[PDB]
């Protein structure tokens, strides 16, 4: 709901990057900033399989990315745990 000000403080200018160029897969539970680990920007081979598994119809990558981004926005509560949710 809120953020710990004594722990946040640092003004963001960019956070939501393609998870790969840096060694940063996590998102610190602190301040509600636009999430970096978007489901819609996951690695192409596995994400294509996850796109099929989630049951998404063939919409072009612009229409598709907005769909799975929006879905991810209301689904994003904590962070990707690497392991499957037990």
mmCIF file of N, CA, C and O in Angstrom:
data_model
loop_
_atom_site.group_PDB
_atom_site.id
_atom_site.type_symbol
_atom_site.label_atom_id
_atom_site.label_comp_id
_atom_site.label_asym_id
_atom_site.label_seq_id
_atom_site.Cartn_x
_atom_site.Cartn_y
_atom_site.Cartn_z
ATOM 1 N N UNK A 1 0.844 -1.219 0.000
ATOM 2 C CA UNK A 1 0.000 0.000 0.000
ATOM 3 C C UNK A 1 0.877 1.268 0.000
ATOM 4 O O UNK A 1 0.803 2.086 -0.926
ATOM 5 N N UNK A 2 1.701 1.421 1.050
ATOM 6 C CA UNK A 2 2.663 2.538 1.188
ATOM 7 C C UNK A 2 4.096 2.032 0.933
ATOM 8 O O UNK A 2 4.299 0.902 0.469
ATOM 9 N N UNK A 3 5.083 2.892 1.229
ATOM 10 C CA UNK A 3 6.510 2.546 1.165
ATOM 11 C C UNK A 3 7.228 3.042 2.439
ATOM 12 O O UNK A 3 6.830 4.071 3.009
ATOM 13 N N UNK A 4 8.241 2.276 2.965
ATOM 14 C CA UNK A 4 9.160 2.780 4.008
ATOM 15 C C UNK A 4 10.067 3.892 3.433
ATOM 16 O O UNK A 4 10.972 3.610 2.634
ATOM 17 N N UNK A 5 9.765 5.156 3.802
ATOM 18 C CA UNK A 5 10.533 6.337 3.360
ATOM 19 C C UNK A 5 11.989 6.245 3.844
ATOM 20 O O UNK A 5 12.932 6.528 3.092
ATOM 21 N N UNK A 6 12.153 5.814 5.109
ATOM 22 C CA UNK A 6 13.462 5.496 5.691
ATOM 23 C C UNK A 6 13.897 4.098 5.204
ATOM 24 O O UNK A 6 13.731 3.087 5.902
ATOM 25 N N UNK A 7 14.382 4.064 3.956
ATOM 26 C CA UNK A 7 14.727 2.825 3.261
ATOM 27 C C UNK A 7 14.551 2.975 1.758
ATOM 28 O O UNK A 7 15.242 2.313 0.978
ATOM 29 N N UNK A 8 13.574 3.814 1.360
ATOM 30 C CA UNK A 8 13.391 4.209 -0.036
ATOM 31 C C UNK A 8 14.283 5.391 -0.358
ATOM 32 O O UNK A 8 15.496 5.198 -0.523
ATOM 33 N N UNK A 9 13.675 6.608 -0.445
ATOM 34 C CA UNK A 9 14.374 7.919 -0.539
ATOM 35 C C UNK A 9 15.001 8.208 -1.931
ATOM 36 O O UNK A 9 14.804 9.297 -2.483
ATOM 37 N N UNK A 10 15.778 7.253 -2.467
ATOM 38 C CA UNK A 10 16.509 7.403 -3.739
ATOM 39 C C UNK A 10 15.523 7.527 -4.923
ATOM 40 O O UNK A 10 14.707 6.623 -5.157
ATOM 41 N N UNK A 11 15.615 8.664 -5.638
ATOM 42 C CA UNK A 11 14.730 9.009 -6.762
ATOM 43 C C UNK A 11 15.058 8.152 -8.006
ATOM 44 O O UNK A 11 16.185 8.227 -8.520
ATOM 45 N N UNK A 12 14.091 7.317 -8.509
ATOM 46 C CA UNK A 12 14.306 6.477 -9.708
ATOM 47 C C UNK A 12 14.195 7.285 -11.022
ATOM 48 O O UNK A 12 13.471 8.282 -11.103
ATOM 49 N N UNK A 13 14.955 6.845 -12.027
ATOM 50 C CA UNK A 13 14.927 7.395 -13.400
ATOM 51 C C UNK A 13 14.907 6.248 -14.437
ATOM 52 O O UNK A 13 14.761 6.490 -15.640
ATOM 53 N N UNK A 14 15.063 5.004 -13.950
ATOM 54 C CA UNK A 14 15.045 3.809 -14.789
ATOM 55 C C UNK A 14 15.288 2.570 -13.948
ATOM 56 O O UNK A 14 16.284 2.520 -13.224
ATOM 57 N N UNK A 15 14.394 1.576 -14.031
ATOM 58 C CA UNK A 15 14.462 0.371 -13.179
ATOM 59 C C UNK A 15 14.012 -0.843 -14.002
ATOM 60 O O UNK A 15 14.653 -1.900 -13.979
ATOM 61 N N UNK A 16 12.891 -0.658 -14.708
ATOM 62 C CA UNK A 16 12.297 -1.671 -15.615
ATOM 63 C C UNK A 16 13.187 -1.928 -16.862
ATOM 64 O O UNK A 16 12.922 -1.415 -17.952
ATOM 65 N N UNK A 17 14.250 -2.729 -16.679
ATOM 66 C CA UNK A 17 15.183 -3.129 -17.757
ATOM 67 C C UNK A 17 14.915 -4.594 -18.182
ATOM 68 O O UNK A 17 14.327 -5.355 -17.409
ATOM 69 N N UNK A 18 15.284 -5.001 -19.446
ATOM 70 C CA UNK A 18 15.322 -6.429 -19.837
ATOM 71 C C UNK A 18 16.309 -7.216 -18.944
ATOM 72 O O UNK A 18 17.532 -7.023 -19.045
ATOM 73 N N UNK A 19 15.745 -8.040 -18.035
ATOM 74 C CA UNK A 19 16.504 -8.896 -17.101
ATOM 75 C C UNK A 19 17.543 -9.759 -17.867
ATOM 76 O O UNK A 19 17.185 -10.776 -18.480
ATOM 77 N N UNK A 20 18.819 -9.313 -17.867
ATOM 78 C CA UNK A 20 19.882 -10.031 -18.573
ATOM 79 C C UNK A 20 21.203 -9.274 -18.626
ATOM 80 O O UNK A 20 22.261 -9.845 -18.315
ATOM 81 N N UNK A 21 21.147 -7.981 -19.008
ATOM 82 C CA UNK A 21 22.351 -7.133 -19.191
ATOM 83 C C UNK A 21 23.092 -6.914 -17.853
ATOM 84 O O UNK A 21 24.328 -6.819 -17.823
ATOM 85 N N UNK A 22 22.309 -6.823 -16.765
ATOM 86 C CA UNK A 22 22.822 -6.730 -15.378
ATOM 87 C C UNK A 22 22.515 -8.020 -14.605
ATOM 88 O O UNK A 22 21.660 -8.819 -15.014
ATOM 89 N N UNK A 23 23.250 -8.222 -13.493
ATOM 90 C CA UNK A 23 22.984 -9.308 -12.543
ATOM 91 C C UNK A 23 21.977 -8.818 -11.494
ATOM 92 O O UNK A 23 22.338 -8.479 -10.360
ATOM 93 N N UNK A 24 20.718 -8.739 -11.926
ATOM 94 C CA UNK A 24 19.615 -8.210 -11.124
ATOM 95 C C UNK A 24 18.308 -8.860 -11.599
ATOM 96 O O UNK A 24 17.692 -8.409 -12.578
ATOM 97 N N UNK A 25 17.922 -9.960 -10.940
ATOM 98 C CA UNK A 25 16.689 -10.700 -11.258
ATOM 99 C C UNK A 25 15.574 -10.394 -10.245
ATOM 100 O O UNK A 25 14.387 -10.655 -10.512
ATOM 101 N N UNK A 26 15.962 -9.833 -9.085
ATOM 102 C CA UNK A 26 15.038 -9.572 -7.960
ATOM 103 C C UNK A 26 14.393 -8.174 -8.060
ATOM 104 O O UNK A 26 14.745 -7.369 -8.927
ATOM 105 N N UNK A 27 13.427 -7.923 -7.162
ATOM 106 C CA UNK A 27 12.798 -6.610 -6.944
ATOM 107 C C UNK A 27 12.678 -6.450 -5.416
ATOM 108 O O UNK A 27 11.971 -7.248 -4.782
ATOM 109 N N UNK A 28 13.404 -5.471 -4.784
ATOM 110 C CA UNK A 28 13.376 -5.273 -3.319
ATOM 111 C C UNK A 28 11.976 -4.813 -2.835
ATOM 112 O O UNK A 28 11.470 -3.788 -3.328
ATOM 113 N N UNK A 29 11.316 -5.573 -1.897
ATOM 114 C CA UNK A 29 10.058 -5.123 -1.262
ATOM 115 C C UNK A 29 10.312 -3.850 -0.426
ATOM 116 O O UNK A 29 10.853 -3.914 0.688
ATOM 117 N N UNK A 30 9.980 -2.697 -1.021
ATOM 118 C CA UNK A 30 10.274 -1.384 -0.440
ATOM 119 C C UNK A 30 9.314 -0.336 -1.022
ATOM 120 O O UNK A 30 8.277 -0.039 -0.428
ATOM 121 N N UNK A 31 9.640 0.179 -2.218
ATOM 122 C CA UNK A 31 8.890 1.240 -2.888
ATOM 123 C C UNK A 31 8.227 0.692 -4.175
ATOM 124 O O UNK A 31 8.901 0.008 -4.962
ATOM 125 N N UNK A 32 6.877 0.925 -4.381
ATOM 126 C CA UNK A 32 6.146 0.428 -5.576
ATOM 127 C C UNK A 32 6.549 1.167 -6.878
ATOM 128 O O UNK A 32 5.913 2.141 -7.301
ATOM 129 N N UNK A 33 7.659 0.709 -7.464
ATOM 130 C CA UNK A 33 8.193 1.204 -8.749
ATOM 131 C C UNK A 33 7.871 0.177 -9.848
ATOM 132 O O UNK A 33 7.762 -1.022 -9.543
ATOM 133 N N UNK A 34 7.648 0.668 -11.096
ATOM 134 C CA UNK A 34 7.339 -0.163 -12.272
ATOM 135 C C UNK A 34 8.294 -1.386 -12.363
ATOM 136 O O UNK A 34 9.509 -1.210 -12.550
ATOM 137 N N UNK A 35 7.744 -2.636 -12.196
ATOM 138 C CA UNK A 35 8.554 -3.861 -12.033
ATOM 139 C C UNK A 35 9.450 -4.173 -13.253
ATOM 140 O O UNK A 35 8.995 -4.181 -14.405
ATOM 141 N N UNK A 36 10.736 -4.408 -12.955
ATOM 142 C CA UNK A 36 11.734 -4.917 -13.908
ATOM 143 C C UNK A 36 11.424 -6.364 -14.398
ATOM 144 O O UNK A 36 11.501 -6.599 -15.601
ATOM 145 N N UNK A 37 11.062 -7.364 -13.509
ATOM 146 C CA UNK A 37 10.894 -8.791 -13.932
ATOM 147 C C UNK A 37 9.531 -9.097 -14.604
ATOM 148 O O UNK A 37 8.859 -10.071 -14.244
ATOM 149 N N UNK A 38 9.172 -8.288 -15.620
ATOM 150 C CA UNK A 38 7.929 -8.453 -16.386
ATOM 151 C C UNK A 38 7.886 -9.828 -17.076
ATOM 152 O O UNK A 38 8.880 -10.249 -17.687
ATOM 153 N N UNK A 39 6.735 -10.513 -16.973
ATOM 154 C CA UNK A 39 6.529 -11.838 -17.588
ATOM 155 C C UNK A 39 6.655 -11.726 -19.125
ATOM 156 O O UNK A 39 7.210 -12.603 -19.786
ATOM 157 N N UNK A 40 6.211 -10.572 -19.649
ATOM 158 C CA UNK A 40 6.177 -10.276 -21.086
ATOM 159 C C UNK A 40 7.589 -10.058 -21.692
ATOM 160 O O UNK A 40 7.714 -10.017 -22.919
ATOM 161 N N UNK A 41 8.640 -9.903 -20.844
ATOM 162 C CA UNK A 41 10.040 -9.695 -21.331
ATOM 163 C C UNK A 41 10.958 -10.894 -20.986
ATOM 164 O O UNK A 41 12.191 -10.787 -21.097
ATOM 165 N N UNK A 42 10.361 -12.040 -20.590
ATOM 166 C CA UNK A 42 11.118 -13.295 -20.325
ATOM 167 C C UNK A 42 11.731 -13.864 -21.629
ATOM 168 O O UNK A 42 11.300 -13.495 -22.729
ATOM 169 N N UNK A 43 12.744 -14.754 -21.474
ATOM 170 C CA UNK A 43 13.511 -15.326 -22.602
ATOM 171 C C UNK A 43 12.573 -16.008 -23.631
ATOM 172 O O UNK A 43 11.722 -16.806 -23.257
ATOM 173 N N UNK A 44 12.795 -15.689 -24.919
ATOM 174 C CA UNK A 44 11.884 -15.990 -26.043
ATOM 175 C C UNK A 44 11.446 -17.488 -26.142
ATOM 176 O O UNK A 44 10.240 -17.728 -26.218
ATOM 177 N N UNK A 45 12.381 -18.525 -26.139
ATOM 178 C CA UNK A 45 11.989 -19.964 -26.254
ATOM 179 C C UNK A 45 11.000 -20.411 -25.150
ATOM 180 O O UNK A 45 9.925 -20.967 -25.450
ATOM 181 N N UNK A 46 11.366 -20.136 -23.883
ATOM 182 C CA UNK A 46 10.555 -20.529 -22.716
ATOM 183 C C UNK A 46 9.263 -19.695 -22.635
ATOM 184 O O UNK A 46 8.207 -20.245 -22.355
ATOM 185 N N UNK A 47 9.344 -18.381 -22.956
ATOM 186 C CA UNK A 47 8.186 -17.460 -22.894
ATOM 187 C C UNK A 47 7.144 -17.812 -23.969
ATOM 188 O O UNK A 47 5.952 -17.621 -23.754
ATOM 189 N N UNK A 48 7.616 -18.335 -25.107
ATOM 190 C CA UNK A 48 6.755 -18.812 -26.209
ATOM 191 C C UNK A 48 5.963 -20.051 -25.748
ATOM 192 O O UNK A 48 4.766 -20.188 -26.040
ATOM 193 N N UNK A 49 6.659 -20.931 -25.004
ATOM 194 C CA UNK A 49 6.060 -22.130 -24.389
ATOM 195 C C UNK A 49 5.076 -21.743 -23.260
ATOM 196 O O UNK A 49 4.035 -22.380 -23.092
ATOM 197 N N UNK A 50 5.412 -20.678 -22.509
ATOM 198 C CA UNK A 50 4.569 -20.150 -21.419
ATOM 199 C C UNK A 50 3.365 -19.386 -21.972
ATOM 200 O O UNK A 50 2.323 -19.314 -21.325
ATOM 201 N N UNK A 51 3.534 -18.830 -23.177
ATOM 202 C CA UNK A 51 2.483 -18.097 -23.893
ATOM 203 C C UNK A 51 1.405 -19.095 -24.343
ATOM 204 O O UNK A 51 0.201 -18.826 -24.261
ATOM 205 N N UNK A 52 1.880 -20.273 -24.776
ATOM 206 C CA UNK A 52 1.019 -21.381 -25.215
ATOM 207 C C UNK A 52 0.325 -22.042 -24.011
ATOM 208 O O UNK A 52 -0.873 -22.336 -24.062
ATOM 209 N N UNK A 53 1.103 -22.256 -22.930
ATOM 210 C CA UNK A 53 0.640 -22.912 -21.684
ATOM 211 C C UNK A 53 -0.440 -22.068 -20.978
ATOM 212 O O UNK A 53 -1.406 -22.610 -20.424
ATOM 213 N N UNK A 54 -0.262 -20.738 -21.021
ATOM 214 C CA UNK A 54 -1.206 -19.767 -20.427
ATOM 215 C C UNK A 54 -2.469 -19.632 -21.317
ATOM 216 O O UNK A 54 -3.506 -19.137 -20.866
ATOM 217 N N UNK A 55 -2.364 -20.111 -22.574
ATOM 218 C CA UNK A 55 -3.502 -20.206 -23.489
ATOM 219 C C UNK A 55 -3.791 -18.919 -24.242
ATOM 220 O O UNK A 55 -4.954 -18.586 -24.490
ATOM 221 N N UNK A 56 -2.726 -18.205 -24.632
ATOM 222 C CA UNK A 56 -2.841 -16.929 -25.362
ATOM 223 C C UNK A 56 -2.941 -17.190 -26.880
ATOM 224 O O UNK A 56 -2.140 -17.948 -27.443
ATOM 225 N N UNK A 57 -3.944 -16.563 -27.510
ATOM 226 C CA UNK A 57 -4.173 -16.610 -28.970
ATOM 227 C C UNK A 57 -3.108 -15.775 -29.729
ATOM 228 O O UNK A 57 -2.507 -14.870 -29.136
ATOM 229 N N UNK A 58 -2.848 -16.065 -31.054
ATOM 230 C CA UNK A 58 -1.811 -15.359 -31.842
ATOM 231 C C UNK A 58 -2.194 -13.895 -32.169
ATOM 232 O O UNK A 58 -2.790 -13.605 -33.217
ATOM 233 N N UNK A 59 -1.908 -12.997 -31.214
ATOM 234 C CA UNK A 59 -1.952 -11.539 -31.421
ATOM 235 C C UNK A 59 -0.510 -11.040 -31.709
ATOM 236 O O UNK A 59 0.433 -11.580 -31.113
ATOM 237 N N UNK A 60 -0.309 -10.031 -32.629
ATOM 238 C CA UNK A 60 1.041 -9.467 -32.940
ATOM 239 C C UNK A 60 1.735 -8.930 -31.672
ATOM 240 O O UNK A 60 1.048 -8.444 -30.785
ATOM 241 N N UNK A 61 3.087 -8.996 -31.623
ATOM 242 C CA UNK A 61 3.886 -8.765 -30.388
ATOM 243 C C UNK A 61 3.560 -7.428 -29.668
ATOM 244 O O UNK A 61 3.742 -7.333 -28.462
ATOM 245 N N UNK A 62 3.052 -6.416 -30.392
ATOM 246 C CA UNK A 62 2.638 -5.136 -29.778
ATOM 247 C C UNK A 62 1.359 -5.370 -28.930
ATOM 248 O O UNK A 62 1.315 -5.015 -27.746
ATOM 249 N N UNK A 63 0.344 -5.998 -29.553
ATOM 250 C CA UNK A 63 -0.950 -6.313 -28.907
ATOM 251 C C UNK A 63 -0.721 -7.344 -27.770
ATOM 252 O O UNK A 63 -1.276 -7.218 -26.671
ATOM 253 N N UNK A 64 0.143 -8.334 -28.062
ATOM 254 C CA UNK A 64 0.511 -9.419 -27.141
ATOM 255 C C UNK A 64 1.238 -8.884 -25.904
ATOM 256 O O UNK A 64 0.903 -9.274 -24.783
ATOM 257 N N UNK A 65 2.227 -7.982 -26.105
ATOM 258 C CA UNK A 65 3.076 -7.504 -25.000
ATOM 259 C C UNK A 65 2.244 -6.680 -24.021
ATOM 260 O O UNK A 65 2.423 -6.809 -22.824
ATOM 261 N N UNK A 66 1.293 -5.874 -24.556
ATOM 262 C CA UNK A 66 0.379 -5.053 -23.733
ATOM 263 C C UNK A 66 -0.564 -5.940 -22.912
ATOM 264 O O UNK A 66 -0.895 -5.607 -21.772
ATOM 265 N N UNK A 67 -0.986 -7.062 -23.516
ATOM 266 C CA UNK A 67 -1.875 -8.039 -22.870
ATOM 267 C C UNK A 67 -1.188 -8.689 -21.662
ATOM 268 O O UNK A 67 -1.670 -8.565 -20.539
ATOM 269 N N UNK A 68 -0.031 -9.327 -21.904
ATOM 270 C CA UNK A 68 0.717 -10.073 -20.864
ATOM 271 C C UNK A 68 1.390 -9.127 -19.848
ATOM 272 O O UNK A 68 1.727 -9.559 -18.745
ATOM 273 N N UNK A 69 1.592 -7.850 -20.233
ATOM 274 C CA UNK A 69 2.096 -6.794 -19.322
ATOM 275 C C UNK A 69 0.988 -6.399 -18.340
ATOM 276 O O UNK A 69 1.223 -6.351 -17.139
ATOM 277 N N UNK A 70 -0.228 -6.178 -18.881
ATOM 278 C CA UNK A 70 -1.423 -5.791 -18.102
ATOM 279 C C UNK A 70 -1.794 -6.903 -17.107
ATOM 280 O O UNK A 70 -2.064 -6.640 -15.924
ATOM 281 N N UNK A 71 -1.778 -8.153 -17.614
ATOM 282 C CA UNK A 71 -2.027 -9.357 -16.810
ATOM 283 C C UNK A 71 -1.005 -9.444 -15.677
ATOM 284 O O UNK A 71 -1.382 -9.625 -14.521
ATOM 285 N N UNK A 72 0.281 -9.239 -16.031
ATOM 286 C CA UNK A 72 1.391 -9.235 -15.065
ATOM 287 C C UNK A 72 1.220 -8.120 -14.021
ATOM 288 O O UNK A 72 1.573 -8.324 -12.877
ATOM 289 N N UNK A 73 0.666 -6.957 -14.422
ATOM 290 C CA UNK A 73 0.516 -5.793 -13.519
ATOM 291 C C UNK A 73 -0.416 -6.117 -12.339
ATOM 292 O O UNK A 73 -0.077 -5.815 -11.186
ATOM 293 N N UNK A 74 -1.588 -6.743 -12.614
ATOM 294 C CA UNK A 74 -2.527 -7.130 -11.524
ATOM 295 C C UNK A 74 -2.109 -8.449 -10.832
ATOM 296 O O UNK A 74 -2.539 -8.725 -9.708
ATOM 297 N N UNK A 75 -1.253 -9.250 -11.500
ATOM 298 C CA UNK A 75 -0.727 -10.520 -10.943
ATOM 299 C C UNK A 75 0.548 -10.278 -10.081
ATOM 300 O O UNK A 75 0.855 -11.081 -9.180
ATOM 301 N N UNK A 76 1.264 -9.156 -10.332
ATOM 302 C CA UNK A 76 2.525 -8.831 -9.634
ATOM 303 C C UNK A 76 2.206 -8.370 -8.208
ATOM 304 O O UNK A 76 1.652 -7.282 -8.000
ATOM 305 N N UNK A 77 2.529 -9.235 -7.246
ATOM 306 C CA UNK A 77 2.234 -9.026 -5.825
ATOM 307 C C UNK A 77 3.537 -9.026 -5.028
ATOM 308 O O UNK A 77 3.820 -8.084 -4.289
ATOM 309 N N UNK A 78 4.339 -10.091 -5.208
ATOM 310 C CA UNK A 78 5.650 -10.231 -4.551
ATOM 311 C C UNK A 78 6.789 -10.104 -5.596
ATOM 312 O O UNK A 78 7.217 -8.982 -5.908
ATOM 313 N N UNK A 79 7.228 -11.254 -6.170
ATOM 314 C CA UNK A 79 8.410 -11.359 -7.035
ATOM 315 C C UNK A 79 8.513 -12.824 -7.531
ATOM 316 O O UNK A 79 7.993 -13.737 -6.864
ATOM 317 N N UNK A 80 9.160 -13.034 -8.706
ATOM 318 C CA UNK A 80 9.381 -14.385 -9.265
ATOM 319 C C UNK A 80 10.359 -15.182 -8.351
ATOM 320 O O UNK A 80 11.510 -14.788 -8.135
ATOM 321 N N UNK A 81 9.880 -16.311 -7.822
ATOM 322 C CA UNK A 81 10.571 -17.071 -6.758
ATOM 323 C C UNK A 81 11.598 -18.083 -7.309
ATOM 324 O O UNK A 81 12.200 -18.821 -6.516
ATOM 325 N N UNK A 82 11.805 -18.082 -8.656
ATOM 326 C CA UNK A 82 12.654 -19.054 -9.408
ATOM 327 C C UNK A 82 11.976 -20.433 -9.439
ATOM 328 O O UNK A 82 11.583 -20.929 -10.502
ATOM 329 N N UNK A 83 11.856 -21.038 -8.248
ATOM 330 C CA UNK A 83 11.105 -22.276 -8.017
ATOM 331 C C UNK A 83 9.601 -22.065 -8.258
ATOM 332 O O UNK A 83 9.103 -20.931 -8.189
ATOM 333 N N UNK A 84 8.888 -23.161 -8.541
ATOM 334 C CA UNK A 84 7.424 -23.143 -8.699
ATOM 335 C C UNK A 84 6.755 -22.897 -7.334
ATOM 336 O O UNK A 84 7.229 -23.411 -6.313
ATOM 337 N N UNK A 85 5.681 -22.084 -7.328
ATOM 338 C CA UNK A 85 4.915 -21.765 -6.109
ATOM 339 C C UNK A 85 4.317 -23.056 -5.511
ATOM 340 O O UNK A 85 3.486 -23.702 -6.149
ATOM 341 N N UNK A 86 4.782 -23.431 -4.308
ATOM 342 C CA UNK A 86 4.428 -24.701 -3.657
ATOM 343 C C UNK A 86 2.942 -24.697 -3.198
ATOM 344 O O UNK A 86 2.628 -24.065 -2.168
#
